[PDB]
Design a protein around this ligand. Structure first.
Ligand code: NA
Ligand SMILES: [Zn+2]
Length: 206
């Protein structure tokens, strides 16, 4: 008796495209900085409670440019990783917090930024890449996917949901950005869930 194929819970032609074409996320590359702070989550080092979906709100920057700026501006903001259509770059260890979502969410969640992309295929790859990175973290930390968007409880959050339910911040990403590419947070969450289940050996790989 073989593993079942995951049945999508959120209709998504983009996720259908990603799956049908067996898109492979790239390696997770480190690019750490010696002077970034190494602060515990509220429950300890190595104790994130979930992960946040952000987007850069910048329609012109590249992943390299975002990282260069952040290395100089980390006292204002920094995040754990960036993804684009080509790369997944982890800029801070997930065992310590990052300064990406305000004083309430930072002690709880891994912060990951989606760099803006400018064609259909690269956007799709960037969603696959976010989802693969997120599912990797959830599996590594033993955190089952649970979306917080509509109840303020779970392991996968948007910046918007942190603003809405937790406070400490007032940003609304990533909903408007994903909508502009004919996608949605719930489509992304469904992809994260599928990849988590693949990594857990519960559903069939692509
Ligand atoms: Na929930
Ligand atoms: Zn954000």
């Amino acid at each position: 008796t073989s593993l079942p194929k995951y049945k999508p819970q959120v209709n998504s032609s983009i996720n259908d495209y990603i799956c049908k074409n067996n898109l492979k996320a790239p390696k997770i590359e480190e690019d750490y900085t010696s002077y970034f702070p190494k602060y515990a989550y509220r429950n300890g080092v190595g104790r994130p409670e979930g992960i946040v979906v952000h987007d850069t709100a910048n329609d012109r920057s590249t992943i390299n440019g975002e990282i260069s700026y952040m290395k100089n501006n980390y006292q204002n903001a920094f995040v754990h990783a960036f993804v684009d259509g080509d790369r997944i770059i982890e800029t801070a260890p997930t065992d310590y917090l990052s300064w990406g979502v305000g004083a309430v969410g930072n002690p709880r969640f891994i912060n990951v930024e989606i760099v803006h992309t400018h064609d259909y295929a690269s956007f799709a790859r960037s969603m696959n890449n976010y989802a693969d990175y997120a599912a990797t973290q959830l599996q590594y930390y033993g955190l089952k996917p649970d979306s917080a968007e509509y109840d303020g409880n779970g392991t996968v959050w948007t910046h918007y949901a942190v603003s809405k339910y937790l406070g400490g911040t007032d940003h609304a990403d990533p909903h408007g950005y994903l909508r502009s590419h004919n996608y949605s947070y719930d489509q992304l969450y469904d992809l994260i869930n599928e990849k988590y289940l693949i990594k857990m050996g519960k559903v069939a790989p692509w």
